[PDB]
A paper describes a structure:
We describe here the first crystal structure of a bacterial tyrosine kinase, namely CapB from the pathogen Staphylococcus aureus, in complex with the cytoplasmic domain of the transmembrane stimulatory protein CapA. CapA and CapB, among others, are involved as copolymerases in the synthesis of extracellular polysaccharides that are thought to be potent virulence factors. Reproducing the Gram-negative organization of BY-kinases by direct linkage of the Cap5A1Ct fragment (herein called CapACt) to the N-terminal extremity of Cap5B2 (herein called CapB) allowed the production of a fully active soluble protein called CapAB.
The structure of the inactive P-loop CapAB(K55M) mutant was determined to 2.6Å resolution. It presents a subunit fold highly similar to that of the CapAB wild-type protein with an rmsd of 0.67 Å over 241 aligned residues. The major difference concerns the quaternary structure of this unphosphorylated form of the protein that associates to a ring-shaped octamer. The total surface contact area of about 2,000 Å between two neighbouring subunits is characteristic of biological interactions. Residues 216b–228b of the tyrosine cluster that were disordered in the phosphorylated wild-type structure form a long loop with Y225b side chain fitting in the active site of the neighbouring CapB molecule. The side chain of Y225b is bound in the active site of the neighbour subunit via hydrophobic sandwich interactions with the side chain of K82b and the two consecutive proline residues P159b–P160b forming an extended hhhhDTPP Walker B motif characteristic of the BY-kinase subfamily of P-loop ATPases. The hydroxyl group of Y225b is pointing toward the 4.8 Å distant β-phosphate of the bound ADP molecule. The catalytic residue D79b from the conserved DxD motif is positioned to deprotonate the Y225b hydroxyl, a prerequisite for its phosphorylation. Despite the absence of a nucleotide in the crystallization solution, ADP-Mg is observed in the P-loop of the CapAB(K55M) mutant protein. This is in agreement with a previous study showing that in P-loop proteins, this mutation inhibits the phosphate transfer but increases the affinity of the protein for the nucleotide.
Numbering used by the authors:
A (entry chain B), C (entry chain B), E (entry chain B), H (entry chain B): 197 to 222, 1001 to 1228
B (entry chain A), D (entry chain A), F (entry chain A), G (entry chain A): 197 to 222, 1001 to 1226
Write the structure that this text describes.
C-alpha cells in the first residue's frame, strides 16, 4: 500500500518541507522515558534533539516577523498530534519562551493526561464564561510552560471556535505569551483545525509515517491551505528506527 | 459508468473545488437521526460534521467580503438539493448567523415538509402581494432560522422570480438576514435556479454521486455560469460509505 | 450524412452556445396543444419550459445593457424560425415585457397564421405609408403581446428593409416596446436577415436538427457575423424525443 | 482540375471572402428572364437575390465609411465581368443609390449592348474632350441608373485612363453619384483595370468557376493588390447548379 | 540545366516581383513589326500591352513619391536590356511623360541603332564637355521621347559615371524630364550599372528566360542591392510562346 | 558507492563551489607534522597550502564587503569540522587577521585538545555569566589567534545559543576580531549549527569524501539554507591522495 | 580539398562578403599586359574591370562616411596581397582620388618592384627620422598615385609601426590623401598587419583560392577582428578561369 | 590521454582565445639561441615573432583603457610560465615600453637565472623592508627592461602578497613603469597567483601543450576567474614543430 513514509514522499506528494522526524519511541532514542514528555524527562536524547530541530525550523520558515502561534494538526486520528504538540511546547519553554499549549480538541482531549492535570475548567468553560481566565490556565512544573486544557466537552465545539469569545481570548493570549501551540482534532474529521488556522495563520502538519493514505493527507493539506494560512511544513512521526543515519544518532561523550 | 463518482471526477470533469462529501445516510453516520434534518436532530453526527465543513469552506472560498446568500441547485431532481439546503441552513444558524432559508422551488416545494411548517402563505403569495412579509416568513423552533416557505404552486413560477417584487423582497432579505439560502428546482429542467443565481451571484452545486450523467452535469454547470454567478463549488451527495475514511470517523 | 444534430455538434462546428433545444412537438412535452403556440396554450409544459430557458439565456448572453431586440433566423426554409419566434415572444410577454413580434418575412409570412390575424396591413404597408402606425400593429388576446404582421407582399422587400422608413420605424419601436422579435426569411436564401441584423445587433440562430447541411449553417453564421451584429447563440429545433435527460422532463406534482 | 471550383478553393487559393455565387443561368434561377440584365428583368429571381447578397456584403466588408466606387475585373475574358457589373449596378439603384456604371472597357465594350444604348459618344470621347459630360452620360429607363458608355474604341485606351482628364472626370463622378461601378478588360491581359483600381481603391474580383486556371487567377490577384486597392472579395460565376442548396431556393 | 525560367523561379530564387514578361518576338504578339520598337510600330499588340503592364507596376512598386528614373540592367550580355529599355521608354512617352532614354552603355551602345540616330555626340562627349547639352540630346519622331545616345567610346567609362559631371547632368536631367531610363552594361561584367544605381535608387532587372545561370542572376541582384538602391522587380524576357494563358492573348474586336 | 567522492559530485549533487580539497594526511603532504594543527606545525606543507587556498577563495566568494565570521559544519561527526576550523583559523591569523576561534560544540568539544588549552572556563560559563569575557577567551602561542573554548558541557547547549547573552557576546566579538570561526556539532544531529549560522549568515560546509551518504549530505545543505545563511561552499576532506595532481606538489 | 575554393566557401567558412574575384592571369583576361600592374597597363581588361568592382563595392560596404584607408592582408605569403594593393591603388587614382600606397611590408617589400621605383628612402627611414616626408613619398607616372616605399629593411619592423612617429605620420597621411592603401606581410606570420589595421579600422582580406588551408584562413580572420578593425570583405585571387562566367566577358 | 593540445582544444575546453603559440624551441624557429631569451638574442626569429603576436593581442584584448600589468600563470609546474614571461617582457621593452618583469615566485624563482642576476635582494626583502627600492630593482643590458627578482625565499610568501606592503609597491610600480609582468607559481599548487591577480585584474594563462590534464587546466581557469580578474587568453607553449602552417614560417629575404 501507498502511503507517506519518508522525507522524499512528502516532497513528492505534498510539495512541502519536513520540519523534523520522530522516530517511534524506543528505549535508545528516549534514554528510557516513562511518560511521552521526552523533552522534559530525557532532554539530552536524540528524539528530544529532533524536537529542537522542529522548533528552529519553525522560526526559520518565516523571517521578517517572528511566528508567535501554530496549529498542530493532521489528516487523521492517532497520528501523534497531541504528542508532537506537548514536546514541542516543552522545547519552546526550555528556550525561554513563555509558552502556552492550548488544548483545542474539545472532543477527545489528551493534553490533560499528557501533563496530568485536572480538566474541570479549560478552553470550553473559558469561552462560555463558566470559568475565569486566571483559574482556567494552569502553570505546570515545567518552567515557562502553561497549559489551557480543553475544559468540559461542549455540545457545539466548532461554533465555540468561530466566536468573538475565541477571537478575544486569542488576542489576550498573544499579549501574555511569546509562543502559542494549539492542539486540534484531525482536519479530515472535523472542521475545527481550519477555524483555528484562520486565527494563527501558521499550521504544522503531522503525518503518521506508519499508517496513512496518501490522498487524505493530500486533502488535509488542501483543507488547511483553503483557510489561507501558511502550512509551515511537516513533522513525520512514528518513523522506523533506521537509525544508521545520524539525524538519529546521539551526540555527546557517553 | 459515465457518472461523476468522486472528487477526482469533479476536478477532471468540471474543474471545481469540492466543498464537502455527504455519504448515503445510515444509522451510524447520522447517529440514529429520525428525520433528514440531521444537523438539528443529531448535531454531533459525522454527516453533520461534514455540513460544518461545507459551512466552513463556503466562507473561505470567497475571502475579503462575506458570502451573504447562496443558491442550491443540481442538474436533476432527487439529488439532495433540498436536504443540503436545509441542513446547511441549520449549520449556519448554529454558527450564530441570523439565517433565512427560502423555498424557491414553487413547483415541487419540500421545505415545509422538512421543517414541518404550514404552507398556506409563503414566497408566491408574498410576491403576488396576497400576504404580508411578516405573515410569510416563519420563525422555527431552531434558534436563528426563519423559513420562507414556497406558498401555493403559482401558475407562473419563473415570471414571479424576475418580477420587481422579488428584487424588492431580495434587497429586503439582505437587510434582514446575515445569510440567505435559496433551495431551487433542478437547473436543467426549468430556469428558476438561473434567475435566483443572478441575484445571489453565488451558487453551491449539488451532484448526486450515486446516479448522474456526466454531460448533463457539466451542462448545469454552464447554465449557472451563464448567469455570471460564482460557483463556489460542488457538494457530493449519496457518497458510497468509505467510512475508512477518517473523513467519516465518529470523534468521539 | 453529416449534419448538426446536438449540442456538441454546435460546439464543434459553429463555436457558439446553444440557448435551448426544442424537442419535436409530441403529445407529452406539449400536454397536447392544438396550435403551435405552446407557451400560450400549455404554459407549464416542458417545451414551454425550454422557451423560458431561451428567454433567460438571451438576457444572460449580454450584461452591461439589456438586449431589447433580436433577429431570429436560420440557414434554410422550414427550420422553425417562425415557430421559435412566436413562442419566444409569448414567453417574453408572460414575464411582463411589452413585446412586439414583427413579421419581417415579406415573402412567405407565417406570423399571421400562427396568431390567426388579418394581414391587410402590416410592415410592408407601414413602410410604404399605405397604412397607419395604430392600425398596422395589432394587440392579441395574449397580454402584453402585439404583432406587426408582414403586410401585403411587396415587390422589393429587401429594399424596404434598408430604408430610412425602416430605420425610423425601428427607432419608434424601441421607445414603445421593452422587447422586439423580428422573424426573418432564411439567411442563405435572401439577404433580408442581414439587413435586419444591422439594426438589432443581436441575432438568434435556429438550426433544424432533423435536417441540415453542416456547411450551409456554417455560411449562415458567417453571413450574420459579416454585419457585425452579435450571434447570441443557437436554438436547436426539432430535437429527437430522448427524453431520458431532464432537460426534457416535466417538473411539478402530477 | 486546377480550377478554383467553389468557396473552399477561394479561401485556400487566394485567402479571400466570397461575396456571392452566381450559378449558370437557367429558366428557373433567372425565372425566365429574356436578357442577361436579370436584376431588372426578373427582380425576384434567385440569381437576382444573390446579387442583392453581393450588394449587401460589399457594404459590410468595409464598415465605418461607405464604399463609393468599385472596379469589376477578372483574370480572363468571358468570366462574367460585364454581366456582374451591370446587374450589380441595377441592384444598387433599386436600393435607391444614385448609381453610375462606366464602361471602362474601351477595347471590347459591352455595356451599350447590355443596356441597349447608343455608343457614339461616351468615356473615350469625353476624355479626348470631343463630347460633353452631359452628352456622354445617359439616363436609362431604370430609375437611378446612368450609363457612361465606352465611346468609340480609342487608339490608346490605358493612356487615356492615366490622363489628367480622367482624374478630373473621376472626382466629378464622385461628386455626382452615390455609387460608381467600373467594368474593365481582364486584368492579366492589359493594365486598364489596374489603373481604374488605383482610383477606386476598391475591387470586386470575378472568378469564373466553370473555366479558370488557378495560377492565372492568383496572378490577377497580385496585379490588383499591387495597386494598393482593396480586394473586397470574389464573385463566383457560372457555378454548377447545386440548387439543393437553400442558397438557391425560390422563396416564394 | 537549372536556370530561371518563369515567374515561380523568380519568386523562389530572387524573392522579387515580376513586373512583366516579354514573350520572344514572333509574328503574332507583335502584329509583325520590322524594328524591335514594338510599342511604337504595333501599339495595340500583346507584347506592347506587356510593356504597359511594366510601366504601371513600376509606378505601383513605390507609392508616397513618384519614381522619376530607373536603371535597367541584367546579369549578362544579350539578355534584352536595351530592347526592354527602348520599348519601355516609348510606353512612358505614349502616356504623356516627357521621357529621356539615356544610353549609359559606353562600351557596346545599341540605343543609337534601335532608334536609328547618329552617335557623334552623346553622354560621353557631354560629360567630357566635348559637346553641348542642346546638341547632345536628340528629339525623336516619337512625341515626348528624347534620346541621349552614348557618344564616342571613352577610355574610362566607369570613371565618367562617378563624376560631379554626371551628378550634375543627372540633376539637370530630373528638372527637364518626367521620366529617365538609363540603359546600362551587364552588372556582372562591369561595375557601371552599380554606379548608375547609386543616383537613381531604383533598378529594373532583366532576366533572359531562355539563357541564364541561376547563381549569376543571384550575384547581379546582390551587386545592385549592395548600392542601397531599390530593385523594383524583374522583367522576364524571351519567354516561350505559351500562349494559352492570357496574359499573352490579344484583346479587341479583330 | 552513494558517496560524494570528488568535486564533480559536489557540483552535481549540491550545486556548490568547492573551496578546497584536503587529502588524507600522510607524512609527505603534512611534511611530517606531529599534530593535526598543520598550518602551524608545517606552514609550508601542501595540506597547509591548500588551507591558504580555502582562505583565499572564501574571501573571493563574497566580493564587495568582507566576510567577518563563518560557521564550520558537516552532515556527520568525524568529518573534519574541528580540524578544518582550527587550521583555517591559523591560516587567517598568518594573514594578519585578528582571529577568534569559538568552540560552539558544547557537547563534544575538541578545540581545547587541538590547541592544548585548559577548558575550565569558556563559552558555556561565559554565557551563563559564571566567568568573565577576558577570563574566557585565551590568547594562544600563535600570533593573532584567540580561542574561546567550549567551557563545561552545559545541560542545555542550543538554548544557550539562542539566548540574549550569545547575541550580546556575538556583537561584542564582531567589534573585537577581524575574523571569527565557529566550530559546531554536525548539523543533521542537533540544531546548534543552525543557530550559529543565523548569526553569521556565512557557512563553510565540510564533506568527508572518504565516508558519506549523499542524501544525508544534501539534507545538511537544506538545513543550513533554511537559516537564510550563505553556503560559501564545500571543503572536501580525506580526499584520496591523487598527489598526481599538481594540486598537491611540494613547491619547493 | 580543405581549400576555400569559391564565394560559397567564403560565405560558409567565414561569413564575409566577397568584394570581387581575380582570376589566374592569362593573355585574354589581362589583355596582353606586360606587367602585373594591369589596371594601368591594360585598363580595359576584364581583370581590371573586376578591380573597379572591388573599388566600387569597397565604397558601398560602408555607407554614410567614406572609407579613407585600408589594409590589405592575407593569411599566407604569395596570395596576391601586394598585387591587389597596387592595382586597387591604380583603380582608385583613375577614379580621381588623390591616392597613396604605403609598403607596410618592411620585411619583404615589393611595391618598389611593382612601380619600378628606387627604395633608398621610404617608410622605415621616414619613421627613424633619417629622411624627410617629401623625400620619402614619390609621385609616379600615374596621375594621382604616390608611393611610400618600404625603405631599407629595419631591424625592428613592428616596433616601428606602434611608434609615435607612425601615429603622427598616419594622421598626416589622412590630411593629405583621399585614400591610403597599406600593403602588409601576412597576418598569421607577423603582427605588422594587425598594427596597421588598428589605425585604419578597415581591412580588405585576400584569400588565394588556388592554394590555402581553410583553418589558417579563419585564423587570419580572428587575428584581424581582434584589432577591432572592420573586415570590409574578401578578395578571391587566382580563381580558376570560369570565363563562362559573364563575370569575365570582354565587353567590348 | 586527453589533454589540450592545440587551439581548437582551448576553444572547446576553456572557451578562451589563444593569444599565441610557442613552438618547442628547436634550432630553426630560434635561429639557434643559447639562452632562452629568444626575443633578445634572435629577434627576427619566428618564435620571437610569436611573442610579438602575444604582445599585440594583449593590447587588443582590452580597448577603452591600456592594460598596464599582467599575471602570467598556469595550472602546473614547468609549463613555461617563466620563459613566456621573460620573452614577453623583452618584447614589451623592444616596443619602447618601460618594462618591469617581477618575479612573484618566492618559492622556486627562476627569473634571476633567465636574466642571470644576483638574487640577494628582490621582492621578498623589498616587502619586508630588508632592502631598498633603488637597490632591489635592477636595470638589465636590455634597454627599457628592469627586473625585480624574487629576493630570499621567505617563510610566508602568500601573506607577503596580501599585504599593504605589496599594495603599496604595486601602486608605486604603476607610476614608474608602462608595463608590469608578474611571474607567479602554478595556480593549482599555491594560492599566490590568485592574490597577484586581485591587483592586476588581467591574467595571461600558459598551457603546456605537451603535458597537461584537461580538468586541472579547467580548475586553474576557475581559480583565476574566482578573483574577478580578466583572463585575457591563453598562450599554448611547447607546441609541436608542424611547421607547415605559417604561423610558424620565417618571413624575410634569406
Ligand atoms: Mg490530538
Ligand atoms: Mg428540492
Ligand atoms: Mg420564417
Ligand atoms: Mg466585359
Ligand atoms: Mg544593353
Ligand atoms: Mg568537531
Ligand atoms: Mg606582399
Ligand atoms: Mg614560473
Amino acid at each position: 500500500d501507498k502511503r507517506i513514509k519518508d522525507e522524499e514522499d512528502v516532497e513528492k506528494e505534498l510539495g512541502l518541507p519536513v520540519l523534523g522526524s520522530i522516530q517511534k519511541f524506543n528505549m535508545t532514542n528516549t534514554r528510557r522515558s516513562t511518560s511521552s514528555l521526552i523533552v522534559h524527562e530525557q532532554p539530552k536524547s536524540p528524539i528530544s534533539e529532533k524536537f529542537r530541530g522542529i522548533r528552529s525550523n519553525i522560526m526559520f520558515a518565516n523571517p521578517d516577523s517572528a511566528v508567535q502561534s501554530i496549529v498542530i494538526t493532521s489528516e487523521a486520528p492517532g497520528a501523534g498530534m497531541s504528542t508532537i504538540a506537548a514536546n514541542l511546547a516543552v522545547a519552546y519553554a526550555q528556550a525561554g519562551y513563555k509558552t502556552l499549549i492550548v488544548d483545542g480538541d474539545m472532543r477527545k482531549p489528551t493534553q490533560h493526561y499528557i501533563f496530568n492535570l485536572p480538566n474541570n475548567e479549560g478552553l470550553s468553560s473559558l469561552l462560555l464564561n463558566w470559568s475565569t481566565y486566571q483559574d482556567s490556565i494552569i502553570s505546570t512544573e515545567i518552567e515557562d510552560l502553561d497549559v489551557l486544557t480543553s475544559g468540559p466537552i461542549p455540545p457545539n465545539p466548532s461554533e465555540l471556535i468561530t466566536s468573538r469569545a475565541f477571537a478575544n481570548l486569542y488576542d489576550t493570549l498573544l499579549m501574555n505569551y511569546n509562543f502559542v501551540i494549539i492542539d486540534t482534532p484531525p482536519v479530515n474529521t472535523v472542521t475545527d483545525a481550519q477555524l483555528f488556522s484562520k486565527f494563527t495563520g501558521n499550521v504544522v502538519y503531522v503525518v503518521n509515517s506508519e499508517n496513512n493514505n496518501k490522498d487524505e493527507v493530500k486533502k488535509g493539506k488542501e483543507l488547511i491551505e483553503a483557510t489561507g494560512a501558511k502550512l509551515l511544513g511537516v513533522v513525520l512521526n512514528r518513523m522506523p528506527k533506521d537509525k544508521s543515519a545520524s539525524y538519529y544518532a546521539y551526540y555527546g561523550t557517553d
